[PDB]
Design a protein around this nucleic acid. Structure first.
Ligand SMILES: Nc1nc2c(ncn2[C@@H]2O[C@H](COP(=O)(O)O[C@@H]3[C@H](O)[C@@H](COP(=O)(O)OP(=O)(O)OP(=O)(O)O)O[C@H]3n3cnc4c(=O)[nH]c(N)nc43)[C@@H](O)[C@H]2O)c(=O)[nH]1
Ligand SMILES: Nc1nc2c(ncn2[C@@H]2O[C@H](COP(=O)(O)O[C@@H]3[C@H](O)[C@@H](COP(=O)(O)OP(=O)(O)OP(=O)(O)O)O[C@H]3n3cnc4c(=O)[nH]c(N)nc43)[C@@H](O)[C@H]2O)c(=O)[nH]1
Ligand SMILES: [Mg+2]
Ligand SMILES: [Mg+2]
Ligand SMILES: [Mg+2]
Ligand SMILES: [Mg+2]
Ligand SMILES: [Zn+2]
Ligand SMILES: [Zn+2]
Lengths: 337, 353
DNA sequence: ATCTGTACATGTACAGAT
DNA sequence: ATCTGTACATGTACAGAT
DNA sequence: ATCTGTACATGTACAGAT
DNA sequence: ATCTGTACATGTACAGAT
């Protein structure tokens, strides 16, 4: 049932191999061509594919080109929590200016590639990414995400975030908060605003997700945490393909929701493979409550509400609410298309 | 009962403070002196190990263990006749004067280390501290501090190799069902340590033989000992794993101070035994505080079985039997067996002394 | 003037004290 | 139940060296 | 400073066992 | 129908060499 849907969603070794070989060539070449104001940049693979929760096909890859910058002063962009003003001379560090040159370089280098069919997607404003379209006969997008790496204490807006104490614990949390934090040129001084990114932390969580250290290891018990994330991701993807009303929603909304549910139900036994249906259903119920109450706090930045009126209109939330409720109460017909 | 014994065993903030201030001064000073221009041990780094740093030191803060570890790149090991734990180490390198052809003499290096320490201790005139007479079979330079209370510090010379652990340890550290594969892989990516075995057993290659140490790994385990990541943390449930270790440690210490028949036994025997029991019973719920008696009792039963069958494998080095006929005579094991059995069946009268 | 090994600055888990 | 000392990990300032 | 080599975790694929 | 064991594949951390 849901088992058979997961069968459909499961990526194939063949496609994984063919997608990765081509993606690695291109990324490797871009990374080499920086190191240039971006000399010192380092590769950090992030998102679904590297978290092992990519569904349906290996067709979207996320990579951070992160740059150590010496200590910086952050000023919070009117109390939003996530957005800040912060070699680099000819870039207050303007996100747009830095991104533009990064982008310019990438585009130049992509022209030189003659063994891969690969172009650079038209810039979407409010995106920190330089997005590559690779046409291995299969279509593959690669987001190249410029990031500043700061080694200081995380900003105070994150003090109450990452509430993993009863789940992953205080030692894990303390160690995670000793890692650097990332600023990505997502814009909101609109064109000089950077946004916090904790993709590195999210990756660790995805791959170290149990209360027991052996969760999902070879001498441990399998849980259904990732399978639930997959299923919820598929529901949204399927709905989004059908209904343009849902343009405003994205997989990060689902990922954030499940982070909260993983905190609510920390016990591995609450995510038993035998309870896949219960688990998926409680995840749906939780997501509906986020929509109803117009509240889905960033896991790392509690005061940043991803479901505020400002980012998503009430009508969109009500639309998605009715569509989820329908699928839930009719055996998820959309999983069969 | 056992709760009240643990109350007795509990160290005091006052004593901890006074012991540590004095110990840290001395160690700090020794570490700085190893870093002189001339010194063959320049580059040595401090690593605090053992009970005190594991929070299983009992009764008083009067014994401290510190490793002065030295990175030794490009090192070749030969196992000393299939014993698992013992190795010859091989290669103006600072260690010139310790080489015998390509063989690194443990006793030569230890002697100079020792000589330096002794010199430096003479210069300290604000702490009453001497160097203990060298005990054969020991890798340690042992400091006797009168604070006024008596405090020993073992300064343990160690070679640090960053390569993959020796094959004798391949099947060791069997934490897969307890701490897991990721923890084990990460632990085995840390360096391994060689300390001078240095005894005067008249044997071949004595004085060039070194022994493995995994005190760094043992420390991590002691302080990250649950199957759940929250074991013993502020948003988790307390277990009685450490409390059992303490109680077993106390039994041995008490018996050892009374009976010279037990000279051959040491706290490392009980630490190794409990490592095996922690592997046997990996679930935190098998170490519930409410079940302290059961848990301690099963630990005793396990240890008795080790004695009876003359078998207690090193946790890291499975083929190395700490309870072999060599090392420990049958009679000693049978003596300790009867003493443990007695205490167990008569309310542990020795806990009341 | 720049660089750097050493010491300090900051933060928190663990466990004892209150 | 809260508070507090020690240990320990990571970042950074700077006198003395280059 | 970069690069390769090694080891093992996280996946998928599929046959034989349960 | 699921589970277990083996093979086959990719990602990733870090040591030692260059
Ligand atoms: N891959 C993808 N792309 C999506 C999704 N919805 C919309 N898009 C495309 O993105 C642009 C830009 O619009 P945003 O709303 O800014 O989209 C971002 C981000 O692209 C998506 C998630 O993308 P991802 O690849 O990072 O996600 P993974 O975790 O790898 O999972 P995947 O399997 O789906 O790839 O979410 C939006 N977003 C908002 N805030 C964040 C944030 O803090 N982090 C991240 N990582 N993403 C965030 C649109 O024009 C559209 O074309 C979608 O579900 N997936
Ligand atoms: N502290 C101590 N000292 C003891 C014990 N039994 C005997 N001794 C004294 O040690 C020497 C003789 O040397 P060994 O027989 O080699 O004794 C070693 C080692 O000293 C002890 C354990 O001591 P520790 O300080 O390392 O122990 P902790 O884990 O910190 O616990 P603690 O509370 O008791 O201090 O065991 C012997 N040993 C054999 N094999 C090993 C090994 O692989 N590692 C370690 N660490 N020790 C090992 C004489 O002076 C004698 O009187 C004893 O129980 N405790
Ligand atoms: Mg993605
Ligand atoms: Mg993306
Ligand atoms: Mg000790
Ligand atoms: Mg000792
Ligand atoms: Zn799991
Ligand atoms: Zn515990």
């Amino acid at each position: 049932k849901l088992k058979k849907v997961l069968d459909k969603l499961r990526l194939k070794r063949k496609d994984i191999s063919e997608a990765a070989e081509t993606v690695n060539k291109v990324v490797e070449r871009l990374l080499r061509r920086m190191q240039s104001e971006f000399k010192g940049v380092e590769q950090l693979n992030t998102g679904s594919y590297y978290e092992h929760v990519k569904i349906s096909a290996p067709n979207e890859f996320d990579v951070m080109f992160k740059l150590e910058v010496p200590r910086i002063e952050l000023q919070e962009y009117y109390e939003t929590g996530a957005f800040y003003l912060v070699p680099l001379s000819h870039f207050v560090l303007s996100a747009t200016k830095m991104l533009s040159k990064f982008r310019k370089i990438i585009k130049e280098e992509v022209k030189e590639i003659k063994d891969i069919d690969v172009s650079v997607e038209k810039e979407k404003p409010g995106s920190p990414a330089v997005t590559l379209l690779i046409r291995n006969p299969e279509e593959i997008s690669v987001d190249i995400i410029l990031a500043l790496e700061s080694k200081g204490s995380w900003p105070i807006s994150t003090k109450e975030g990452l509430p993993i104490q009863g789940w992953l614990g205080t030692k894990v949390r303390t160690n995670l908060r000793r890692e650097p934090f990332y600023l990505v040129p997502k814009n909101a001084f609109q064109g000089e605003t950077w946004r916090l990114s904790f993709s590195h932390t999210e990756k660790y969580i995805l791959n170290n997700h149990g209360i027991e250290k052996t969760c999902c290891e070879s001498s441990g018990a399998k849980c259904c945490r990732k399978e639930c994330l997959k299923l919820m991701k598929y529901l949204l993807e399927q709905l989004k393909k059908e209904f343009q009303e849902l343009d405003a929603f994205c997989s990060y909304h689902v990922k954030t929701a499940i982070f909260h549910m993983w905190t609510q139900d920390p016990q591995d036994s609450q995510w038993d493979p035998r309870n896949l249906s219960s688990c998926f259903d409680k995840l749906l119920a939780f997501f509906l409550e986020c929509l109803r109450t117009e509240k889905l706090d960033h896991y790392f930045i509690p005061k940043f509400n991803l479901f505020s009126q400002e980012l998503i209109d009430r009508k969109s939330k009500e639309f998605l609410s009715k569509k989820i409720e329908y699928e839930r109460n009719n055996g998820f017909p959309i999983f069969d298309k």
